[PDB]
């Protein structure tokens, strides 16, 4: 059925699965025309296709040429997403094909089901999780490859860097969702937390800084604080009063549709 809080461990079992997030496929700037009308200008987008057990990210860059002379772009974007996920599955060897594809948005279900009719044993599922994958374009190296693209391109990343050498997939995913939630809530403050200390850098072959285990605990705490501080600023709530249940409940409540 739907992927929810009840069935969270299933993300880290040995059945190959992919999350598909389409929220950065069709991206526009809105501007005034010379006549004082409004017009959109598309910018390059991406499909965010992630194996949550391995960290393997299949970033399909959607170049603005895809949209040229097309109508109903927000509708086309879902079908183009399903087309490209379908193409990615067909490109993989049988033993690497997913058993399940979880879409972050329910509007992706019919387009993906129709493109995947040739794969009746691959389950297409929605999720009840509110996942912050829209904030992918706040990861500087992912933003850079998307914006520089002059043509359609697929780029492969490990979104966990080398974390799985030291932590489980469950913990790696929890760290990823906390970082992306913080970047989505207050991007400038999150980047400051990650990047302000110049003695900790990002390896050429990584996306995130080379934090020790103790430095990751500090960073994780600072990200939680950022999310709680922003929830206080949003709702005009004295966060200084809150208890640990209240705080846990607010950060995870944001991970839930």
């Amino acid at each position: 059925g739907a992927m929810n809080s009840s069935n969270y461990a299933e993300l880290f079992n040995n059945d190959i699965k992919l999350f598909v997030d389409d929220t950065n496929v069709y991206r526009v700037t809105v501007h005034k025309t010379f006549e004082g009308n409004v017009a959109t200008k598309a910018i390059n987008g991406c499909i965010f296709t992630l194996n949550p057990k391995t960290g393997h990210l299949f970033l399909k860059i959607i170049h603005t040429s895809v949209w040229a002379g097309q109508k109903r772009l927000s509708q086309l974007a879902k079908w183009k997403t399903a087309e490209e996920v379908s193409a990615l599955v067909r490109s993989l060897p049988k033993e690497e094909q997913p058993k399940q594809i979880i879409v972050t948005r329910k509007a992706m279900l019919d387009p993906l089901e129709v493109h995947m009719l040739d794969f009746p044993n691959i389950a297409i599922r929605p999720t009840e999780l509110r996942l912050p994958f829209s904030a992918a374009m706040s990861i500087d190296k992912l933003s850079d490859v998307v914006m520089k693209a002059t043509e359609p391109q697929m780029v492969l990343f490990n979104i966990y860097d080398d974390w799985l050498d030291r932590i489980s997939s469950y913990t790696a995913f929890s760290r990823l969702t906390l970082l992306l939630r913080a970047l989505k809530t207050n991007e400038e403050s999150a980047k400051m937390i990650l990047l302000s200390d110049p003695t900790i850098t990002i390896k050429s072959y990584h996306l995130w800084p080379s934090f020790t285990d103790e430095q990751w605990i500090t960073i994780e705490s600072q990200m939680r604080d950022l999310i709680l501080t922003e929830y206080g600023r949003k709702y005009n709530v004295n966060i200084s009063a809150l208890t640990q249940t209240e705080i846990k409940d607010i950060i995870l409540g944001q991970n839930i549709k």
Partner: protein, 300 residues
């Protein structure tokens, strides 16, 4: 021009003949139905007074043979039978007519309702949907499943409606996924009309037969098939003008005939709202839209 005589009526029963119905008492001297109009299929149907779950009937055409009804106390139902002896049959009918023990098919001269509901329905097409080749008439009941319903169990007692599935390889050409899912013209025109039905008359005949089985038997799978065949047309941008104009007539008479008190079980909100207000054909069904808006505005 003919007559369906009854041996007897040993159990209290509501008898339907087409859109008409009447109550017969246990052991009432009822011996059948006369003055049945030649030129149309007909359906004789039953609902027992002591058990409303017994809801069943027979599609027939008086041009194909001499048919009568006899109660079977073993199987507990009124059975249709064919009499091969023309002289015997004529002699029995004459006796019952002289003793005035038959009800008359109560057709008003001005009233085209039954023609309007069965315009495209042919006995030879019914016999392909309902497979029992040793009889010239077709048994249907409230609980019979469709080939499609059985896929998702006895194949001999099933309604062989044409399978329509919008998320199937049959409905979607590889490479035309968005086009074929958002515009079902390919599926309607090439696969269904040119491919399976051969013409719009056969398509409409099956749509009309599905509606009638839904209405007369409360057959759920028949109701699904009726809505699927409406939705397949309404969801196609490219439909011949003659087919849209005819669909409007077909649906108008179906909506006209539907009992008011059965609208909540026989009409699918999503399909009708989509067909009348969202689909490519939202402006093509003037007569249907007006009767639906005046008779069932709560559904819309």
């Amino acid at each position: 021009m003919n007559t369906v005589p009854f041996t007897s009526a040993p159990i209290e029963v509501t008898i339907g003949i087409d859109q008409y119905s009447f109550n017969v008492k246990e052991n009432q001297p009822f011996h059948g139905i006369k003055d049945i109009p030649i030129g149309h299929v007909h359906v004789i149907h039953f609902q027992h007074a002591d058990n409303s779950s017994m809801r069943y009937g027979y599609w027939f055409d008086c041009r194909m043979g001499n048919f009568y009804i006899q109660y079977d106390p073993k199987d507990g139902l009124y059975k249709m039978m064919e009499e091969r002896d023309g002289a015997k049959f004529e002699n029995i009918v004459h006796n019952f007519k002289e003793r005035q023990m038959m009800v008359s098919y109560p057709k008003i001269d001005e009233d085209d309702t039954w023609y309007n509901l069965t315009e495209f329905v042919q006995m030879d097409k019914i016999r392909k949907i309902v497979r029992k080749d040793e009889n010239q008439f077709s048994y249907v009941d409230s609980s019979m499943t469709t080939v499609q319903e059985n896929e998702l169990s006895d194949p001999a007692h099933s309604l062989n409606y044409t399978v329509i599935n919008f998320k199937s390889r049959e409905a979607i050409r590889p490479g035309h996924e968005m086009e074929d899912f958002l515009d079902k013209s390919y599926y309607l025109n090439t696969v269904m009309l040119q491919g399976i039905f051969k013409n719009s008359s056969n398509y409409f005949g099956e749509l009309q037969f599905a509606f009638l089985n839904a209405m007369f038997f409360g057959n759920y799978g028949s109701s699904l098939q009726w809505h699927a065949m409406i939705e397949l047309i309404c969801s196609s941008a490219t439909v011949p003008k003659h087919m849209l104009d005819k669909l409007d007539e077909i649906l108008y008479y179906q909506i006209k005939t539907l009992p008011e008190q059965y609208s909540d079980i026989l009409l699918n909100e999503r399909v009708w709202n989509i067909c009348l207000y969202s689909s490519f054909q939202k402006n093509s069904l003037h007569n249907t839209e007006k009767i639906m808006e005046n008779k069932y505005p709560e559904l819309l």
